[PDB]
Symmetry: C2
Subunit: 486 residues, 2 copies
């Protein structure tokens, strides 16, 4: 299978082909659920190991809470269990959409003293959000894998520092592992987590459809949940005070974002840092050659590379041509391929082809390990810098509302001065929705056309005094990133 | 909190105290579900890492399949989802009790050629079995964490070899990691997995209540599921043949078995190979001492031990006495404690106390790392050998049915010659159930009294010719292990 849809022409068909023909996903009879095959699951394991190691250094501990929540606990897009076999439960129980109402009664019991704080827990599990909108493999599904962390602190300042530290870990998850550039920012009051005080986010951008997408999230819950669940601690005075809480999560959406960011017309391109196969060795196996010698040297090279921690597989299958194998591992996104035939063996070199650019190198066997390490770092860096340039070109800085629709029609995000009044965001969503529908009827034309806030970026351009809001004309408070979204 | 119930007197109360006061579990409002706190979850992560590494060496790959299964797919103790919010789904969908019916349609699609075999997949997830019997934390719960592996092979012999290789991994999981002795064997026709051809098992034994328990399971499914799901492959001839399948699983039940096996009146005893804290360092901190010097040496020793891969924590909390800390870490089962005070510092030694026997050692700082490594191996081995001696003393070899009830009253298993006729197992279950109820009414007295087969052990004692079945008098075929069970 080759990918035949072009990424810049039919992006939806291209994406489906890339994830199916690489054997990353399989479809399923229940809408919005997808099977995650090993080729994709290996990447999830890699980013999971990364994030787990990092939060353990912060003193976060893993745990496991039940997948079921009582009606009363939850009620204090949800799939309800109502019967065991054909017997009706007295109270129906819900499948977790998130675990605040499952965990926080326990927290209230566990926390008594300032000596019990901070309390830092995480769990890896799946959650269920049963919407009816258009599902997208990896990006927006009814069941998905995630991690959710939940912490409790004696002070707001300590909780806020943790929120930001986790957000930095999510920046590293995307930018350092997956080579996807993200924008750190704060959500608007309309878009933040309802029961929380402040929601921070990293946002990603999909150029081919112009859409922003929330990559991960980190919430300062403050004391609201502590009030509702009576999570209190005693200082050394003996005075009871509410804890200050955080929660934060990130999902297999990250994989989809990586796929969309780096893929090309040939299929997947997997950044070397998360590729389960970094180097595929393809021996050339003529009938009229010493095949034993060539396969032996491939095994020697595999051992030599694995001593440098390079993840290698040899595709020595005799029933497929080298051309078939080149395409097979290109579709799967292996970042380097190493070709070895009798002429290479005679010269003591190997031919290495990088997946992102197709550039080829002749490398002597003694230089192979350090040169491939350097090449993989270069591939990783180049994937990131090109995605970052696409991000910067995808954002238009505007000053008035009449620049919105043209910028959206170019599939761009807009960075605009905003008064942050929450009524104005609703007005903007509804107006851009209506104008988008008009434009659709003029084009002769599934996913919403409305523009919403994506985030208020931590990195703020200058704000000249007396800059007006781009929609209300009221005095503008901060630069805000807007766009169509998932 | 100290444990105050005695293990040999009130075993159920002892178990609850040990797992609650060590902070391993927390209760939950839904019967049969329990929260797994970090102290327990760390042990699960350890055995998970072990088993994952081992099966990856066998070429098994992890994956993730949805938690939901359609009514038709399943129907081809189950919790049914029937509504999203308060809207009724056209077909109700079930939460997975096991994933054969979720995975095998996909297998049928993926397998076309002998070149596609073997196919070896595993997943780590939770499943739901919604029974109403008495739940037991770790051992028998409505939701539990497990791994389930599913493989497909071109021949029965290859599938059978895999079944046995996995069963050996489960023996290692219990005996090598958890120091719990298990018995490998084959399940009776009445107790085997229904749709499979042959079920193998490792069985454990709980002496304090006399009960056997299935520790893990590995099934030769053969071609039955291949028939039902039309999983076929083509040889190089072009003839379509059914695949031969296996499936195998093991759960957090293993943790409960470990707890019950090694615990004592003081609480948990965690084998060093899975203990998240292997050595706890407790500084003695008099008011009238150079506390800075003692804490500094504790940190030096921690660094030195961690260079030998020993997992160390220092409990330098000033507001608790050393006696309090000794009990606190004993209850949690830390296998070694290291005490350091001014006199030790003056002598250049440390006092080390092993959790299992309470024996103390004075060890010079230079010998500390290799001596503690040797001590931990000795602790691990001694935990295992004492549990193995308890297992051997808990099994009575009998020849006639009238020895059954006395052996059961001694809380023993029986090894008996058996005709393996399936009707006889039902008769034996019902008769021993009835006799147990009579005995209960004579004692002035929740869990079933019936005796069933636990397994037909791979290791068979000699079978003198003409040995009769202990219940039917028919010619006996093999020695069978029987007992009361979970
Ligand atoms: C795969 C994935 C991811 C996420 N979300 C949420 C926000 C978040 C972030 N950031 C989580 C907090 C961490 C994220 O990734 C959400 C989802 N499904 C849904 O909303 C349900 C759905 C299904 C079909 C169509 C529309 C909606 N599906
Ligand atoms: C914790 C745990 C474990 C296991 N089982 C099963 C066999 C197996 C083995 N071997 C699995 C194949 C791997 C195992 O461990 C099973 C369970 N709950 C249940 O049966 C449901 C239940 C709940 C309350 C009372 C009675 C029954 N709960
Ligand atoms: C955060 N979040 C997200 N989605 C949900 C869906 C249903 C119920 C609660 C939630 C919820 O809390
Ligand atoms: C194995 N196993 C065990 N338990 C179950 C419970 C309900 C339905 C199917 C199963 C099942 O298949
Ligand atoms: O869903 C959310 O956004 C928060 C963060 C993870 C748990 N709850
Ligand atoms: O439940 C069982 O016993 C088998 C083995 C794991 C998956 N199904
Ligand atoms: Cl291969
Ligand atoms: Cl900030
Ligand atoms: Cl501590
Ligand atoms: Cl055998």
């Amino acid at each position: 299978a080759m990918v035949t849809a072009k990424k810049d022409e039919n992006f939806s068909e291209w994406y489906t082909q890339a994830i199916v023909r690489s054997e990353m996903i399989e479809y399923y009879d229940i809408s919005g659920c997808y099977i995650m095959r090993p080729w994709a699951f290996h990447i999830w394991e890699k980013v999971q190991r990364f994030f787990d190691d990092e939060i353990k250094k912060m003193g976060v501990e893993n745990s496991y809470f039940p997948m079921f929540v009582s009606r009363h606990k939850l009620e204090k897009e949800v799939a309800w269990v109502t019967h065991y076999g054909d017997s009706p439960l007295p109270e129906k129980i819900a499948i977790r959409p998130t675990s605040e109402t499952i965990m926080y009664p326990a927290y209230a019991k566990w926390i008594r003293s300032h000596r019990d704080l901070p309390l830092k827990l995480n769990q890896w599990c799946s959650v269920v959000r049963w919407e009816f909108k258009q599902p997208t493999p990896f990006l927006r599904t009814r069941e998905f894998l995630w991690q959710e962390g939940h912490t409790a602190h004696a002070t707001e300042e300590e909780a806020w520092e943790l929120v930001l530290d986790i957000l930095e870990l999510y920046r590293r998850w995307y930018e350092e592992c997956l080579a996807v550039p993200v924008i750190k920012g704060e959500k608007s009051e309309g878009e933040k987590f309802a029961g929380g005080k402040k929601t921070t986010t990293v946002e990603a951008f999909i150029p081919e459809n112009g859409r922003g997408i929330q990559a991960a999230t980190s919430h300062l819950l403050g004391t609201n949940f502590a009030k509702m669940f009576e999570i209190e601690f005693e200082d050394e005075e003996g005075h009871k005070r509410l804890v200050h809480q955080t929660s934060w999560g990130c999902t297999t959406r990250s994989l989809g974002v990586m796929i969309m960011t780096h893929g090309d017309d040939k299929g997947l391109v997997i950044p070397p840092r998360v590729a389960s196969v970094q180097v595929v060795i393809i021996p050339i196996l003529f009938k009229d050659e010493n095949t034993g010698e060539i396969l032996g040297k491939c095994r020697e090279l595999k051992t030599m590379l694995e001593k440098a921690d390079i993840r290698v597989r040899i595709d020595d299958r005799s029933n497929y041509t080298p051309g078939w194998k080149y395409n097979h591992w290109e579709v799967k996104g292996v970042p380097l391929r190493l070709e070895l035939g009798p002429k290479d063996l005679a010269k003591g070199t190997a031919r290495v082809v990088r997946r992102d650019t197709g550039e080829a190198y002749q490398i002597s066997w003694a230089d192979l390990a350090p040169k491939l390490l350097e090449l993989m770092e270069g591939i990783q860096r180049s994937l990131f810098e090109k995605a970052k340039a696409r991000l910067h070109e995808g954002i238009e800085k505007i000053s008035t509302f009449d620049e919105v629709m043209p910028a959206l029609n170019r599939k761009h995000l807009v960075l605009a001065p905003w008064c942050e009044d929450p009524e104005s965001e609703e007005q903007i969503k509804k107006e851009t929705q209506k104008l988008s529908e008009i434009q659709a009827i003029e084009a002769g034309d599934v996913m919403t056309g409305a523009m919403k806030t994506l985030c208020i970026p931590f990195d703020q351009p200058p704000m000249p005094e007396g800059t007006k809001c781009f929609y209300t004309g009221k005095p503008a408070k901060r630069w805000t990133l807007w766009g169509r979204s998932y």
